[PDB]
Amino acid sequence: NEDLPISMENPYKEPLKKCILCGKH
Amino acid sequence: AGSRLETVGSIFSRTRDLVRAGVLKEKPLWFDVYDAFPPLREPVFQRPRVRYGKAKAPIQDIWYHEDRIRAKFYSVYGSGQRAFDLFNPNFKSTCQRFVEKYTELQKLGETDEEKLFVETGKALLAEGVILRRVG
Amino acid sequence: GKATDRMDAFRKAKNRAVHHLHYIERYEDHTIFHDISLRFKRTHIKMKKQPKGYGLRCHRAIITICRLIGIKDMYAKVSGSINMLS
Amino acid sequence: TEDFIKKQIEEFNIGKRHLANMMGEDPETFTQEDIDRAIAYLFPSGLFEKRARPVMKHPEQIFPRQRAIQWGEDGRPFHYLFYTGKQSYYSLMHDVYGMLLNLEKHQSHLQAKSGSR
Amino acid sequence: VESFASMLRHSPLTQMGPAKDKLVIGRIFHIVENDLYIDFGGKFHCVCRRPEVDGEKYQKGTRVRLRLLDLELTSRFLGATTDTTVLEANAVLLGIQ
Amino acid sequence: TDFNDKILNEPLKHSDFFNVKELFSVRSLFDARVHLGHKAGCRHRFMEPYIFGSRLDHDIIDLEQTATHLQLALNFTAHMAYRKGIILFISRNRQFSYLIENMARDCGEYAHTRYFRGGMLTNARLLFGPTVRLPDLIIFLHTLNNIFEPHVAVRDAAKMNIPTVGIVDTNCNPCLITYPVPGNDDSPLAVHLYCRLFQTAITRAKEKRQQVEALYRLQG
Ligand SMILES: [Zn+2]
Ligand SMILES: [Zn+2]
């Protein structure tokens, strides 16, 4: 009842790998 | 015999219509068991299709809030030294000990997540389990 | 039913056709329940309900097999491709 | 066709009796090798193929084996794997994989409880 | 009192989250001549090979230690409408207990 | 001739003539790992009414109506063996092929887990003989054959006017499967839960078959 899953935004999601020159100019 | 057209309808439908038309002079056994005790869905033949366009699947994702607690627990500590025994029904690992202590500390009312995390580390150190954080 | 001689092909068609069967429920044992307008790949078959004195205003194959179902009273206009199998 | 096998075995037996009678021996001693000698002398075929001979033998080599009926009057198959068609070969394969499985079980439990063609 | 959502809210597979490099114990139920089959729970099993260290120690019934790579290892290919599975999970072996 | 009529008329009037509610629970199905599933990339469209949800792209069967499915599934089977049904365990999977072939043996029935040779169900009339009683009920444990396609006996048996009560996966296709149950069919704990269950359903049916035969010869 209260153990029903609740639709949320997907944890354990790895942060996406930028390239090696990404924040550089 | 009778029909071999599996695409006309369900097998109960064709057998019913065929014995009711009376060419069949003998009623089969599973027919009586079928109309006596019916299934939930009639098993009538369907060609499958393919989703095209903005249609998606109505099968949801299964999450909990304790999964979000396990998220930061795994980002810090990784897996604890207790290897999982998935034959154990009540295997309460360091993730489970962490999240149970975290819930009964959210029952205190500390809104700050970091002191909840740290007091959870202190409650596990009061339990007696060595925390292997990648410092 | 396909063969090289005729009479065994006739035998084949009869013996295979008994094992492939529909049952068609007929309204008062003389006419279909409503009107039907569909096509089978090129063959717009089109049938409408008809009362008891109206005979078979049907295609010759439709005349024959509607006699063999037990339908007696119907109208039918088929246009486009007139292949017997379709 | 089983009744034909009964009639053939009793005809082979009474022909053995009449061969012992015409050969002057006892029906209790007149045997198969002597049967072959006697009928081989008595009917001299001039052919090169030995299957084209005058043959009177044990008729179960003369007759092919008529197969056992797998169902009684109720129609149920007697053998468990009848509905694969190849019942005997697959039954034998099942038994041999069972012998190999209990042999592997014996090797593991042996570590646990310690010309021809 | 015990519902269905109750059985799998705190079930161990929901407890451990994603199977990216987690320690798991698993046992042996079948061996063919080079290979041992490691039934660690979940849907399928994984197969691995005898290391030379503790060679006849890895026998039928022993527990081992697994690193738990992903649980099924399927991938849709170029022109297939559905991905093909392997019925395996294929984790990395460590040692015993 | 009415005693035979009465001996089969009586069990048609109760939802459990053999009381099969007790033969499993939802706890044992969860504790035999039936609720897990394949990848959601291999998820099939007809399974969307028989799936609880997705756990990190692993698909979970709604185990509540699974029991309700299995209630009528066991009800169908044990009513059939009461009336002397021929039950065919067709299970084309080479991981439990040895297990099932003795399950039909020690329940007195039949099984075909081997390679399906061609005109088996359809052209029975010369593959086996002129008069041959075909199976009146065919149980599937794995509806996928070893190439991950619908096994042809699924398409063949319903074509032969014979009902099929299968174990259907989360990647199968339960279209001509009359009494499907959404369950895992891959783990050895799950198929052993099945192989104990159908073994019980036949055997509980057969002893209540023999007692009512003794009930006719009780009075006469
Ligand atoms: Zn970039
Ligand atoms: Zn299957």
Contact between F159 and B45 under an 8 Å Cβ cutoff? The reply is no
Report the neighbours of C using a cutoff of 3 or more CB pairs below 8 angstroms: B
CA distance E49 to chain B (A): 21
- The H or E element spanning position C75 is strand C74-76
Q: Which ligand is nearest to the CA of A22?
A: 1
E1 interaction partners in chain A (CB closer than 8 Å): none
Chain B residue nearest residue F32, CA to CA = B87
CA distance linking residue D23 with residue D107, whole number of Å:
63
The total of other beta-carbon atoms located within 10 Å of residue E94's CB is: 14
CB contact under 8 A, B4 and C20: yes
Residues 63-92 of E with CB under 8 A from F: 71-72, 74-76, 82-85, 87
D112 interaction partners in chain E (CB closer than 8 Å): 59-61
Residue F92 Cα to ligand 2 midpoint, Å, equals 8
Q: How far out from the chain centre does Cα A24 lie?
A: 23
Point out residues after which chain C has a gap (C–N over 2.5 Å). Answer: none
Going by C-alpha positions, the residue among F73, F61, F67, F98 that lies closest to residue F188 is F98
Residue with token string 């990404």: A22
Chain B residues within 8 Å of chain C (Cβ atoms) = 1-5, 8, 14, 17-18, 20-21, 23
Q: Are strands F181-182 and C79-80 parallel, antiparallel or unpaired?
A: unpaired
Residue F180 Cα to ligand 2 midpoint, Å, equals 11
F88 interaction partners in chain D (CB closer than 8 Å): 83
Burial grade of D96 (CB within 10 A; 0-12, 13-18, 19 or more): exposed
CA distance linking residue E89 with residue F180, whole number of Å:
28
Interface-testing mutation among F88, F102, F132, F136, with chain D (most D C-beta atoms within 10 A): F132
CA distance E48 to chain D (A): 19
**To 10 degrees, what angle do helices D2-22 and D32-42 make?**
80
CB contact under 8 A, B48 and F76: no
Chain D residue nearest residue E30, CA to CA = D104
CA distance linking residue D7 with residue E4, whole number of Å:
72
Phi, psi dihedral angles at A8 (to 5 degrees): -130, -170
CA distance linking residue D8 with residue F129, whole number of Å:
26
Interface-testing mutation among A2, A3, A13, with chain E (most E C-beta atoms within 10 A): A3
Chain E residue nearest residue A12, CA to CA = E18
H, E, C per residue of chain B: CCCCCCCCCCHHHHHHHHHHCCCCCCCCHHHHHHHHCCCCCCCCCCCCCCCCCCCCCCCCECCCHHHHHHHHHHHHCCCCCCCECCCCCCCCCHHHHHHHHHHHHHCCCCCCHHHHHHHHHHHHHHHCCCCCCCC
CA distance linking residue F9 with residue E81, whole number of Å:
50
- The H or E element spanning position F209 is helix F188-219
According to the entry, how was the structure determined?
cryo-EM
Residues 1-25 of A with CB under 8 A from E: 1, 3-5, 12
Q: Is B67 on the interface with A (CB under 8 A)?
A: yes
Going by C-alpha positions, the residue among D113, B87, B29 that lies closest to residue F85 is B29
Residues in CB range of D90: below 8 A, 6 or more apart: D81, D84, F114
CA distance linking residue C41 with residue C68, whole number of Å:
25
CA distance linking residue F165 with residue F174, whole number of Å:
10
CA distance F216 to chain E (A): 45
Q: Which residues, listed in sequence order, are joined to residue E39 by a DSSP beta bridge?
A: E27
CA distance linking residue B12 with residue F162, whole number of Å:
9
The total of other beta-carbon atoms located within 10 Å of residue F5's CB is: 9
CA distance linking residue B64 with residue B102, whole number of Å:
14
